[PDB]
Design a binder for this molecule. Sequence first.
Ligand code: HEM
Ligand code: HEM
Lengths: 723, 722
Amino acid sequence: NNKAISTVEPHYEDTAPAEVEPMMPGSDKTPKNRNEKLTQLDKFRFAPQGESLRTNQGVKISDNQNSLKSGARGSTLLEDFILREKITHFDHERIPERVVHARGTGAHGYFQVYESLASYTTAEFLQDPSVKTPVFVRFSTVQGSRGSADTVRDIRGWATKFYTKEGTFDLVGNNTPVFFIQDAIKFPDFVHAVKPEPHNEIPQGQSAHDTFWDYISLQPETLHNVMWVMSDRGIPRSYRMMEGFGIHTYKMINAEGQCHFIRFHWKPVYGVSSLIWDEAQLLTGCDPDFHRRELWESIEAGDYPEYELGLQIIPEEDEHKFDFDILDPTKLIPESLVPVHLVGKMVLNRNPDNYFSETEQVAFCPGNIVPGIDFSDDPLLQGRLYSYIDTQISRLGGVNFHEIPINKPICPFHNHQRDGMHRMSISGTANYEPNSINNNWPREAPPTEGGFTTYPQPVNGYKSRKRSSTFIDFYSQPRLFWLSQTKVEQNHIVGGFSFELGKVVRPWIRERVVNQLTYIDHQLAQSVADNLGIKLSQEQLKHPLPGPINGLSKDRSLSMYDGHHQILKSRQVAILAADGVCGDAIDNIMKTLKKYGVHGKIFAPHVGRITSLQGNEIEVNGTIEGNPSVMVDAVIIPDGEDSIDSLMKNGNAKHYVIQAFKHLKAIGLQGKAFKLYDALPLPKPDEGIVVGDKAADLAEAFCNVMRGHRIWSRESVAQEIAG
Amino acid sequence: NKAISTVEPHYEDTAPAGVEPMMPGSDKTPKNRNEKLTQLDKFRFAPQGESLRTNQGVKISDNQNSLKSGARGSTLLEDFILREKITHFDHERIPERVVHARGTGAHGYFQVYESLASYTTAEFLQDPSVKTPVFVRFSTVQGSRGSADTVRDIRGWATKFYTKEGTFDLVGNNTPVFFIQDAIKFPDFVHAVKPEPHNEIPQGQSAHDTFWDYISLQPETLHNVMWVMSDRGIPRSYRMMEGFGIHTYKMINAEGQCHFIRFHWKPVYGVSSLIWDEAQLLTGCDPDFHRRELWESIEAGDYPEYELGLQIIPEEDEHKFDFDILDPTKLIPESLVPVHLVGKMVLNRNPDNYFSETEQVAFCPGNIVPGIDFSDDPLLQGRLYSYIDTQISRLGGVNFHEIPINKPICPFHNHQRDGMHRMSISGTANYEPNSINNNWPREAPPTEGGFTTYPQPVNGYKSRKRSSTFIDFYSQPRLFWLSQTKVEQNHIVGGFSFELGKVVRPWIRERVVNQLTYIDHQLAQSVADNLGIKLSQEQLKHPLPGPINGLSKDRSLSMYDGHHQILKSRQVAILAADGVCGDAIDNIMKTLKKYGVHGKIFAPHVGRITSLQGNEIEVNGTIEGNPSVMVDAVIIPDGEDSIDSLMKNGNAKHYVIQAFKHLKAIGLQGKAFKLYDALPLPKPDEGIVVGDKAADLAEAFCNVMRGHRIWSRESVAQEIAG
Ligand code: HEM
Ligand code: HEM
């Protein structure tokens, strides 16, 4: 009554209750994680504690619940400037999404070099190991719009902004070492092919449709990066557990004018780990924010994303020594031939305060580079230089987007540029160079004092539109990639191809792709052709295959699961429990998990607390229904007679074990919890099943099984299970 | 050579020398024509035999390479072809709509059954011979452009009527009420339901803290929360949901008589919904399910069909109800005021280009025509200023009416000039009154059709204040609750319990169920239990609202009470492998075809399977790529070899378990029961149809399907692991 009426009257009272945790802005949750960039952004942060609600002109608002009307039942008056300003700001909140990589996630951190790279570059942020260079990273997918799901099969973008004392350096990479195309002129064609089709805008976040594969079949240059995205690299488990690549060959110029060709790498301290397809798909349905959320909670937990910056270094005289052109972006440089030197460390240790201000409005370009780094003649990179700044003029509202806080450098940046939309700087001095009325300040900087110069590379040829003959080589590296994959990874590649072409309606497109696969590997083609009902002619089964690359038929560095570099720390475990559960078994599991930095979450039939058979309340993390097995790495079911009975009448709790089994995950069953597995149509316990009566001992064995990531041996029987 | 060819200019042919792919509407249904579509032909491009050119008309010889300083050199700034191709691509994107960003569009027409001159002078409602063109966009609310179709959300429903007396936009939703009463709260409500601003989580979901925090503090939202928590929030198709303009409008007739009006759309294909677990899985394996369903249904001839209905109230009965008809959180119960079906709308042509037509279409509630008018509903009043304001940024300026999909098909002369991308070239005087052009174009007198506002009396004081008569938050939620079948009530409890499960701060969940105790004590207790909340004795005694003009239920607010289930156009999976019974499929298909139902053969691989009779039969797609959640029901024909392979296949055994848990009809012919009996599934209930003869098993199968879902199965479905 009075309580009812009060909700639609001005709210002058406290609303919060009188006084495990939700996600919060980084300033709230990790204020002790600072850097120079974050300190610069503080000038723009708002502390509204104890402030009046106001208009943008600073007028206190007395009634935020009602429009100005002519009678409390009347027509709204045009003179309600508060209503119109509030609605008008609302009406204009949206800006264009990125034309590609629209779906992204940001975090702040810092970078340090291990020791001076002055033997190879003058670049300031690689000279001094004591400097902490602030960074901001945006991870992304490629195909989908804002609001598409995270765990699609797709390439992942990886864009790092280095706020150095001598300029902002943008390393704009992907999570695979090659790209689909060789020349930038094909990029709108390729992108249009993979994007939703123009008549119906179908499908979202997916390459599994006609026009993408039509384009692949007609442009063999794409086959290499298709193999990468068709592998499990196409569905990583976390942005903390994938590799990063600059793809293009850059140049690094040292203080002696010498040039070294270089390729950029990010190696993850937490290993390289991926989902499997069926699990990646179900995750898009039940948590489209899975990667965004995982990254966010990673930082709040102190499991900071941590990556080592690696360089491949090739002397100028060595440019032409490989079977491939090192300026070809569909070619990787196998790490067997040119090792990766780890030269520094990046840590992401603080989430943003405002997604839109920081992550949405950030602007990265390959062209922003700093003295000591320079471009190569890669024709894809050369085209990128012009696109990033062009697109951002309309995405971010004009030529002054570097004045938006997240984009500003931390060093001076005086010049003679003036005006443009939303000009924030205010300049009084002469706006032309050379001038004498200001004694020509600001002034050009000699190269020996840090002024950018281009390396004087020789240029000889004719003005020409032509693909380099040194680029015509489309199958060598797809075949190298294939042969470096373990048996399971090859099977999943076959699954990627077979699932995707399965969604292509036009039959000639599937046959044209399968025909391209016969030039990569005959068994790969045969396996895919079988899943599609295609019969391969005797000719196709004899098609010529490429030979080794500079002596190499394999390179283990291209396999995710051969290197045995799986990391246990920071993984997520479901503890299925209900009322009547053994409280001390849970307590001992949580000690063993925390010992190895693993995160156990109690999932129950309802939120709140459950009561252990010892009568203590145990906090719940979520419900079994809202937290499917696809959201965790392994499942442990502790004991408690009444807990198990309850879990056996819950189809979700039982499906939890069938699903986790089919996704090759480790399952621990303490004591009478084995009844659940038994009830299910599940075969004999394999290596990935850990049964035991004492909790701390079950959990130790359970963690050791987790060290293998997935139980690949199980894959054949797992297919048979109805789940 | 084959390889070299692909990186050189492509002067040769590339074409080779359900069953068919989705295509532009101009290619598949060219015979479905209307006046707006003929106007759009003026802007269609036919590229057969044409050269690839720049935008200035210059022929391009090599679309494969940048201009370089040599074949391995540096790209040249003078390559204008490269820069023009890249620049256009760089600026393809325009802002998404601030709400309803995620949407699907189709063309069609509308006919009035008989003249409505008794009520309105609106030209498109006068003459039943006219086919007045329309364009409809369906949408969700919360999610951005690439979010899933089958989220739990309100669905937007926007119809543009291209009439000869102006373009009229009917911009409504699929539930008869909105969340809030005054437009000034729209940014607050929308911010609360949208992803939260620090992390931009979560997408296409209200299941998070800020949304329920807002609900808990704004009881006026509760009524439409009930609607979204019910199965209304997850419809099966845009063809099977209802539509409402929600606001009370006005219709004025030739005599100057005013009637209050509320708009309705009633689906000829009935009102059907998904269930929550099936909706959520559908967003994983097909985020485009509704967009695809609408497109294919039009290419198949199952044209969406809706009847435009009107609740009509004489201006004198404005105050005859226990609620304010100006309150957009209130519906008018169809018992109290029946809905008159006044005409039909059919959607029968897909667009040619999604971006040109669906993305660029602009609809505003302020786009009315002579014969319709506004009421003093304070939410509608704010909407009049917002639609046009936002379209200036989203669509590039004030000339967005000149974009083809947005143009009227009547004349539209005035004195407006310039603006960004001005298309028309106007030679005459640009002010009124003028003499140098004898004042053309001229004002139209009302008796010749010039718009006038009905002279409604206006009295009071300039004030910011919620009308006393708007302060009724709990009565219509209760009406809606008591009007639901038992299974629909359970599903509402499900929505509340799942959603509040994702809320982190406990006090928000507690404050929300506390609000539920003022709607129905047993709804509050069910939801409180699912969340571990113990209700106090005081809470359990909380006063409940009485009836509304003597009404305690209204059957029309229920989906599954008045048997609104249509069978025509449903989708049936047919699980077949190599070794299936040929004659069975034929007789299944002939039976399904007899009823307007589409059956789709799903096999382990794509292409063809061979029957035990040795013939080949076309597959529609894999079992793996088309889970049970995409079809209305499953049928498994016989064929010992088919059954044997299916039983080795995890997906096909799960197909039936999942079909079962989602309460769908499962047909099993012959030894197909071999497969059912192998799974942990109970004895065949009323929605499990066995039989050895296909036509009979199909006929009985199609008749279980008429009930939409086996609601009885619900209790045993919960315990099935799957
Ligand atoms: C080596 C292959 C390429 C890689 C690894 C790459 C990487 C990326 C990444 C990671 C982003 C997202 C940056 C962010 O988070 O804001 C991006 C955006 C973009 N890229 Fe690429 N890209 C490549 C090729 C191309 C090409 C060939 C073009 C066209 C010439 C292009 C044009 C763009 C544009 C316009 C954007 C959006 C920029 C913005 O709106 O801020 N990229 N690229
Ligand atoms: C009765 C409750 C409301 C309903 C049924 C409603 C319905 C809709 C629908 C269906 C759309 C999508 C139209 C399309 O497909 O393009 C939409 C968009 C929009 N609405 Fe509402 N709305 C309501 C209340 C509001 C309010 C209170 C405001 C703010 C004053 C508002 C502002 C907008 C804006 C700015 C758009 C985007 C328009 C565009 O970008 O073209 N609406 N509304």
